[PDB]
Amino acid sequence: KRQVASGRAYIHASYNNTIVTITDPDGNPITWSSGGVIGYKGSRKGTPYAAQLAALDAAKKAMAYGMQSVDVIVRGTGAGREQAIRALQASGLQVKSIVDDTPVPHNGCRPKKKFRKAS
Amino acid sequence: AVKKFKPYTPSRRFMTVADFSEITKTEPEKSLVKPLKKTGGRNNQGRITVRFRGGGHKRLYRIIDFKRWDKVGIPAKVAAIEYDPNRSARIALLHYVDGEKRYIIAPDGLQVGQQVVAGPDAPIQVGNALPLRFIPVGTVVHAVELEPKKGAKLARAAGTSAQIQGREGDYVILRLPSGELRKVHGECYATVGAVGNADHKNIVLGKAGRSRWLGRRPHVRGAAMNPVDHPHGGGEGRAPRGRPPASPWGWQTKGLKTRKRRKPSSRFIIAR
Amino acid sequence: MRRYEVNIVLNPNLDQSQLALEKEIIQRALENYGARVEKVEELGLRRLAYPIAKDPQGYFLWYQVEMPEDRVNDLARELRIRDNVRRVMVVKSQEPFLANA
Amino acid sequence: PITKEEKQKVIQEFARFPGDTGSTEVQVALLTLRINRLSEHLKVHKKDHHSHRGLLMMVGQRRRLLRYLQREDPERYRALIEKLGIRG
Amino acid sequence: SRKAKVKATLGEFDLRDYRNVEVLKRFLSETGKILPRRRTGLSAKEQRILAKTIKRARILGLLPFTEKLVRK
RNA sequence: GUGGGAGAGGGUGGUGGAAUUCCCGGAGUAGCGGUGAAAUGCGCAGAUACCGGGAGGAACGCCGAUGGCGAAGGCAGCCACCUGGUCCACCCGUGACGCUGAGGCGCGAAAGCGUGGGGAGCAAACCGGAUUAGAUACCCGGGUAGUCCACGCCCUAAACGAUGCGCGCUAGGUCUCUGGGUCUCCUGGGGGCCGAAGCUAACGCGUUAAGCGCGCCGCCUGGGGAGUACGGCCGCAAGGC
Ligand SMILES: [Mg+2]
Ligand SMILES: [Mg+2]
Ligand SMILES: [Mg+2]
Ligand SMILES: [Mg+2]
Ligand SMILES: [Mg+2]
Ligand SMILES: [Mg+2]
Ligand SMILES: [Mg+2]
Ligand SMILES: [Mg+2]
Ligand SMILES: [Mg+2]
Ligand SMILES: [Mg+2]
Ligand SMILES: [Mg+2]
Ligand SMILES: [Mg+2]
Ligand SMILES: [Mg+2]
Ligand SMILES: [Mg+2]
Ligand SMILES: [Mg+2]
Ligand SMILES: [Mg+2]
Ligand SMILES: [Mg+2]
Ligand SMILES: [Mg+2]
Ligand SMILES: [Mg+2]
Ligand SMILES: [Mg+2]
Ligand SMILES: [Mg+2]
Ligand SMILES: [Mg+2]
Ligand SMILES: [Mg+2]
Ligand SMILES: [Mg+2]
Ligand SMILES: [Mg+2]
Ligand SMILES: [Mg+2]
Ligand SMILES: [Mg+2]
Ligand SMILES: [Mg+2]
Ligand SMILES: [Mg+2]
Ligand SMILES: [Mg+2]
Ligand SMILES: [Mg+2]
Ligand SMILES: [Mg+2]
Ligand SMILES: [Mg+2]
Ligand SMILES: [Mg+2]
Ligand SMILES: [Mg+2]
Ligand SMILES: [Mg+2]
């Protein structure tokens, strides 16, 4: 449909897996990858290494649509975090800054028992 | 609200009567009254088409104003709040400055002595009828037209209301008392406020005869008939349904959806 | 009677004769609830920290009145009947509090 | 809330002489004043139990006062009563 | 950690006044949170008044509820 | 009394943003979730991740504290109205008007109950997946009362400082909240640590007493039986005294 030079790159980084969707400037996904698309199943998806392959592969698919630059927004604590950023910086894809958009309730819904803990 | 009774008879222990302290009209009604032809649930053939009706008090029909768009701009004082036997709600009497009298179905909060008005004008205030398009999103409203100029249809039962949830083109989205979500035309009148006398739903009829006063004749379970009569008629003692539960005419009465599929009105509906 | 400051934020896209349109109704109301204006500052367009109503900006007014205390709540209820009034903030006037002083 | 003059009014009226700032009679009246106000505040806000606690203390202070007064000058007691509308 | 005290930086000002961003704008972090007393250098009583004001300010749209974190 | 303060103190009405969930639109593909590791579950009927719109309920991030208020239970976005207690200064008024308090009355976390409503997230019960010899649990996926509001009940608690209330007397040091001053310092009402004397079985307490004294109330008299039975009173019930 369309091929774009400038773009945007999203990192959803959780304990059980890391997933990277890369968008157009407007925010609509061009293409994406995750710990599972790399070829891991299970806990090994949460790992920092698989997040690396994930982001490299994300970008490799985007660069084939002619992605050049991206703005890299990350969300959430996880071991996939930095190795995902790292992997994007030197991959291809000049990365223009970075942000932490990780969601933080201003004290919203009561959490699951698992995250309630100390009160 | 809700008068209770010491148990000086059985059924006086559970009976519960409406509160009439909102009512200023004593007995009589304004001679906007007209006579009611009681049907007995019988159609123009002499045939019962709706079962277990009949009996119950004589009633005079109070004629009530379901288009407010004649009196556009002409205000009115609220003269009386009265009892109307034909509806769950109460009627309020309006003296227009015109000198004309009309009955309005009486909104919750509406006081005797208030001024009321209806039109594209008018404050957003309890009693005031407006085209829907001019009522601010979010205000709760009763007595809505479904199509323009055709008369109020929705939210007329005591305690009911509707809410304006949004605008789309010439229509607005309302949430009906059913909870259904409906596009209605912006041009349709509505009158701000809930209907009120909302304590209505807590009356406890309390004895058989009180259902008989409202013209509800005893209702008999298909379970208690024979099979000539009903799909549940039959079989020694008691007995369960023996089949998926049915009406006397034999269609299924748990879950079977009965709204016609291809109704044109479906373009304008969104919910339960 | 008590001194309040009435902050009111308006649709930005309103043309000036509409701004004055919404601004009159504001003022009858003020006069109707018994608000006697003292000061005023009309600071107009301003840039917002977050969108109010999908809008990066909003048109600000601030009044300062002496009105009977008990009618302030309805005032603001009525002020807020919008549609173009996107905020009302009605605060009790205070004797300023200074730091480095 | 009872304003400065509003109470001054009540001070002046019940004062046993020029410039009486809180003798027994002024106190009862002054109490009775804010009691009656609270009592109406509760009539509306019936759920406000914290303020009702105070009312109780008010009511009680006023009672102890009134008992002293009824022991010392039983006459200007009965007369303070009917002026203020209290025991019957 | 050194930085500034951030009260030091400006002269007399009204911490009651909820309408001037450029004073109040300076008491918010890079992500927009109200700055802890330690690096505002305010008092006990003073920090409350500051805070309450900042809260108002945000409702009026003048001050943010949160910004993002840039260039980590 | 007069003039001044601080405060998540209480009641009512409004109101804001973040997030969660669901829906609509878009783009987009082969997994997502979840764990110790998994499996259930979800997903090519287009999931997850991404953006735009909308709906709805709950709780208020930073500030925020070793902080403040209340008799206690408790009380935390912002706004207004009504409203309680409280402290300081001035030294003006009454003239012991005081303390305490069996009964009485009122308030009283959570859960629970009735009648309506409301229901996003959570989550007893319940279902399913793992684990185990078993697993009616612990972990995972679901999930209904309930959690929320109004009115009305229930009256309990590690309802704790396990420390009744008022008063006078008995070194200091240090931190902090909030008043007043001849604003380094001094002074008053709170909140914490260390400590004189004394107390204490010890641990510890110590001008916020558990010290030295007076008033008045509540309570104890070995453990179990048992906060059970009986009776009585109260509750819709659970059940409470
Ligand atoms: Mg995993
Ligand atoms: Mg015939
Ligand atoms: Mg008869
Ligand atoms: Mg029957
Ligand atoms: Mg038979
Ligand atoms: Mg037959
Ligand atoms: Mg048959
Ligand atoms: Mg049968
Ligand atoms: Mg037989
Ligand atoms: Mg049988
Ligand atoms: Mg039978
Ligand atoms: Mg239906
Ligand atoms: Mg306060
Ligand atoms: Mg207050
Ligand atoms: Mg979709
Ligand atoms: Mg006060
Ligand atoms: Mg003196
Ligand atoms: Mg003397
Ligand atoms: Mg309770
Ligand atoms: Mg509860
Ligand atoms: Mg039950
Ligand atoms: Mg309930
Ligand atoms: Mg219910
Ligand atoms: Mg639900
Ligand atoms: Mg199981
Ligand atoms: Mg098993
Ligand atoms: Mg579970
Ligand atoms: Mg769950
Ligand atoms: Mg007790
Ligand atoms: Mg005990
Ligand atoms: Mg001290
Ligand atoms: Mg010693
Ligand atoms: Mg024995
Ligand atoms: Mg027990
Ligand atoms: Mg017994
Ligand atoms: Mg007990």
CSV table of C-alpha atoms (C1' of nucleotides) and ligand atoms in Angstrom, one decimal, chain F residues 113-116 146-150, ligand 22:
chain,number,residue,atom,x,y,z
F,113,C,C1',-28.4,-8.5,56.8
F,114,G,C1',-33.3,-6.0,54.3
F,115,U,C1',-35.3,-2.7,50.1
F,116,G,C1',-33.8,-0.4,45.9
F,146,G,C1',-19.4,-8.8,47.9
F,147,U,C1',-16.6,-4.6,47.2
F,148,C,C1',-19.6,1.1,45.4
F,149,C,C1',-24.5,4.7,46.5
F,150,A,C1',-29.2,5.6,49.3
G,22,MG,MG,-26.4,-5.1,50.0
